[PDB]
Design a protein around this nucleic acid. Structure first.
Lengths: 49, 172, 159, 58, 185, 48
RNA sequence: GGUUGCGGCCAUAUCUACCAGAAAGCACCGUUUCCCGUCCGAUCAACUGUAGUUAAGCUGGUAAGAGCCUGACCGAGUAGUGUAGUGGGUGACCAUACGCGAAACUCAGGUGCUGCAAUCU
RNA sequence: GCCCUGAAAAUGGAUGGCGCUCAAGCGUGUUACCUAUACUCUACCGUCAGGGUUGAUAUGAUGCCCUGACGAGUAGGCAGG
RNA sequence: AAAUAUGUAAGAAGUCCUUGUUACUUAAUUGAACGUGGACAUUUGAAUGAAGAGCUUUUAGUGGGCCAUUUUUGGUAAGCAGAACUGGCGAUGCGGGAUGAACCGAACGUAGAGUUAAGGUGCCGGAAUACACGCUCAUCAGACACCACAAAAGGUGUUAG
RNA sequence: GGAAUACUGCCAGCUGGGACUGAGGACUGCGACGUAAGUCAAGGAUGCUGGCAUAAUGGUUAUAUGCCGCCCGUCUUGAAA
């Protein structure tokens, strides 16, 4: 997994530099994952949310 | 809306089989982080082309650093803004070392003098003014005269302690 | 005082579509209905018999009976904190096969088939629908598409 | 004295304490209101198929 | 705080022990909770629980009812288990052999079963013979046959029995019970 | 299945603060709430 | 491809005007003994297919034609709207943030498609 | 935009008070700092849940032991005292 | 002709093949229903969650409500009267709004340590008489949501356009 | 042309100061370091030293000081009224 990671990240970096080099723009994949933190307490909340 | 950086934002409409390769549009946006800058990109694009970010994508976002961050320049600033009772265009001048430095004083100045918060202003153009005396505005021309010097009368030093055993002076 | 007749509040609901008044075309009478079919109810106010009460306009239920001129339909209606089961005798002018049960049956076939070619190749299938996924990396080129840069526009009156 | 006249206020809070569930679905549902001739013949159909199923047990 | 999604400190709605104070029953319980815990065997888990049941939920199982179950294909030699009491029934004539384990036999039921060459076992006796419930047939009385339940769900068109104390024409048979007197139900 | 096996993470309040005068506006508007994108790491790290 | 009978969808099929139509069909068209209906064989009924005609019907063409249809980063990401703030404003009201999104307008293109059976230079 | 006029009510008096004028005022930006019965970690009380254990072997099997979570309350219901 | 709200579906009670029953139905073993026998279980037919799901009996209190944002009717208006959805108060302390049923924050076993919220940090009072660019001088300045009001109209005050 | 630095981010990089806690009670578990026997910071604190006796310390009580604290019961949308 250390390798997987290390080379995915590196890959993306070089992708970008190559596009630049070709006069193109690399556009990154949209994020497949998020972390969400609830920051409002628990009173007065509308049913749907 | 803070300590400003300036970004190139480049975006486009999503590809269709009908139009792969749709045209690319760029804006220079002043904002403090890139989440704001892309927001701002879409806010303007939506007022200028049919596109919502749901039909478009951002292709590139890149910070543009000041080229000569210690040459002093005089900048022309063009601004559109809302007052409590209408909306106005306005040309002002700012003397500074970087666009990013200029723009930030623009925002403080719109706040001080016209009570314009950030939501209410659009930066229309910002430009180094090439030839001195294309400078139009007194309060910047004043600084452009030859062998300019001035004193700073009445100097107040801040004191580190609450009592002082001598009556201070303002002498500079 | 107040007024709550049977067709109360129905002026726009039971009205006919603009430039679509008059005889009802025969397709309506040629559809066949079976017990267990899923129909959508929608009143035709030009046919006053066999007519759904207005609560059922826009609602979809299951056929539970078939008759000379009508189908019986089962609707689940909420009264209080609980659905009650309701059965309606609608004439056919007021009913229409539910189109989504059709996509569904079509897909069930498509599914059986996808399963077949997969087994008669002995491979994995994957038959359930995924939702729209994030979007993979692309390289946009600039050949013929050097970015055009835009700026905000000055206020102006057009009046 | 006049008093309040109507409101729904609170009524959905109340319906949703224990509430809503759904229908009570069965295989083999109520034949209530189904065409009498039809039913009368379904009877005979079912009797017969029962008969034969037992006929195929000797 | 916490947006609770479910009632806090809710107690499972189940008996955990018999409400009875009969020492002997507690002992049968003490036996079965060892058995239930220490063997796999679904059987004891079932018998464990049934020991906790209140009287309304142990309706009696009758001796003809055992006769009938014994006529199930492949059942004739099973030992039939009633976590409750078995009652006599002058209605079957031919009654077969078997071994019935129950909480209680009425005198006629013991007689019946015995006379036909069979055997009456208590639950601990059934335990030793069948620590895992092997070859047993658990039977249960008709619980909704009770008089109380005739009146549940009483309402317009429900088909239930009023709580009447005294019956005949002249008691609750007129307005609301026949089309000729107001409405009907 | 993996993610569900993980109980909800119980974070503390952020050590060092929220960095804005008011949480209940959007991150775009001066802060907390909504998608702050990459900047979630800095926030979660101070909460963890 | 034409035409007829029975249709599906029900104007891209309707409307106005002017042209054009071989062949077959369809039509108009001749007749009044009969069944049948009229103030009136006009309609409706019957009879011949015989005496006649494409005039009309009908089909298709024309038209910076009326209407109808379709498209469009045409207008407009506008109007309106779900959600957010101890945002602005004396207020009326307005701006920003995450989203959804019209109508009229303008311009471009189009003006029936089709199922069954029969028949035709 | 700020400021000034327009701007009249009754006991003496209220940006909360003092007082503050390149503010301790108005607009805006940036850091640090103070602080709830909230959040994080830990002890203890209780409630609920799940689990183990009289197999022969001293003193509670409605017991002993292990583990996780949870705790606002009028009218009112039940429980243990 | 929206937005928000709203109905149904996303399969084992399913699919396919074979051919049984009837008094219904068809010109017609033709349909319609219900079935026998045979085949198909890895993703078996989107997502996310499930603190277990389903069910029965019986009985308390209540049946004056009120408030806020938004929609909204009557009224010149009202701390007025009347509806819509949600969230609150009532039944509820705690931190902030000096004060205060209803606003902001946040809901509560007994405690220790840490961190924050809303709100604040001259002194009263815990916390920079902090940093930065302006603007403002009032012989009636001004000073913070709900909130404890101010307008038309004027100024050669001063600012920027 | 060749560097540096800032900014942002990563390290299963090394270290200093301060504060609260120390539940548990033979052994069982997962490991780590050792060539090894052994060792350990690895399923919850130990070790060394000292201090106190008509006392260190703790409970109670009175009083002062800081901050806080309206009269209960009732009906009520709303009671310190």
């Amino acid at each position: 997994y250390q390798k997987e990671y290390e080379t995915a990240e590196r890959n993306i970096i070089q992708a970008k530099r190559d596009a630049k080099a070709a006069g193109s723009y690399y556009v990154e994949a949209q994020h497949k994952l998020v972390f969400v933190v609830r920051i409002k307490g628990i009173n007065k909340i509308p049913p749907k949310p | 809306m803070a300590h400003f950086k300036e970004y190139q934002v480049i975006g486009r409409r999503l590809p269709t089989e009908s139009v792969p390769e749709p045209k690319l549009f760029r804006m220079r946006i002043f904002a403090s982080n890139e989440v704001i800058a892309k927001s701002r990109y879409w806010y303007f694009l939506q007022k200028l082309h049919k596109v919502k970010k749901a039909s478009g994508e951002i292709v590139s976002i890149n910070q543009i650093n000041e080229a000569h961050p210690t040459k002093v320049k005089n900048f022309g600033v063009w601004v559109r803004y809302d007052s409590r009772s209408g909306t106005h265009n306005m040309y002002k001048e700012i003397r500074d070392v970087s666009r990013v430095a200029a723009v930030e004083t623009l925002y403080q100045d719109m706040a001080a003098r016209h009570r314009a918060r950030f939501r209410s202003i659009h930066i229309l153009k910002v430009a180094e003014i090439e030839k001195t005396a294309d400078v139009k505005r007194q309060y910047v021309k004043q600084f452009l005269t030859k062998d300019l010097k001035f004193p700073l009368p009445h100097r107040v030093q801040k004191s580190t302690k609450t009592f002082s055993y001598k009556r201070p002076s303002t002498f500079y | 005082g107040k007024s709550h007749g049977y067709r109360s509040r129905t002026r726009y609901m039971f009205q006919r579509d603009f430039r679509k008044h008059g005889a009802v075309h025969l397709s309506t009478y040629l559809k066949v209905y079976k017990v267990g079919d899923i129909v959508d109810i929608k009143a035709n106010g030009s046919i006053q018999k066999g007519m759904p009460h207005k609560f059922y306009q826009g609602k979809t239920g299951v056929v539970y009976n078939v008759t000379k001129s009508s189908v019986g339909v089962i609707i689940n209606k909420m009264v209080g904190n609980r659905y009650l089961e309701k059965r309606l005798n609608l004439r056919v002018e007021h009913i229409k096969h539910s189109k989504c049960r059709q996509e569904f049956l079509e897909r069930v076939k498509a599914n059986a088939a996808k399963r077949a070619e997969a087994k008669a190749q002995g491979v994995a299938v994957q038959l359930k629908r995924q939702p729209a996924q994030p979007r993979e990396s692309r390289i946009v080129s600039t050949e013929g598409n050097v970015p055009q840069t835009l700026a905000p526009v000055p206020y102006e009156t057009f009046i | 004295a006049k008093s309040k006249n109507h409101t729904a206020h609170n009524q959905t809070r109340k319906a949703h304490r224990n509430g809503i569930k759904k229908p009570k679905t069965y295989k083999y549902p109520s034949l209530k209101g189904v065409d009498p001739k039809f039913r009368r013949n379904h009877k005979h159909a079912l009797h017969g198929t029962a008969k034969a199923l037992a006929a195929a047990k000797k | 705080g916490i947006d609770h999604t479910s009632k806090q400190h809710k107690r499972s709605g189940h008996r955990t022990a018999p409400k009875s104070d009969n020492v002997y029953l507690k002992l049968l319980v003490k036996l079965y909770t060892f058995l239930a815990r220490r063997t796999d065997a679904p059987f004891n888990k079932v018998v464990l629980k049934a020991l906790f049941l209140s009287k309304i939920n142990r309706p009696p199982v009758s001796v003809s009812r055992i006769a009938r179950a014994l006529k199930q294909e492949g059942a004739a030699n099973k030992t039939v288990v009633v976590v409750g009491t078995v009652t006599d029934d002058a209605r079957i004539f031919e009654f077969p052999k078997t071994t019935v384990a129950a909480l209680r036999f009425t005198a006629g039921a013991r007689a019946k079963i015995v006379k036909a060459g069979g055997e009456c076992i208590t639950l601990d006796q059934l335990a030793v013979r069948a620590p895992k419930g092997q070859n047993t047939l658990i039977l249960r009385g008709p619980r909704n046959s009770r008089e109380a339940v005739r009146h549940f769900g009483m309402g317009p068109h429900k088909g239930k029995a009023p709580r009447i104390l005294s019956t005949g024409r002249k008691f609750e048979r007129a307005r609301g019970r026949r089309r000729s007197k107001g409405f009907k139900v | 299945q993996a993610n569900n096996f993980l109980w909800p993470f119980k974070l503390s309040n952020p050590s060092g603060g929220w960095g804005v005068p008011r949480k209940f506006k959007h991150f775009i508007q001066g802060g907390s709430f909504g998608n702050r994108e990459e900047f979630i790491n800095k926030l979660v790290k101070s909460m963890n």
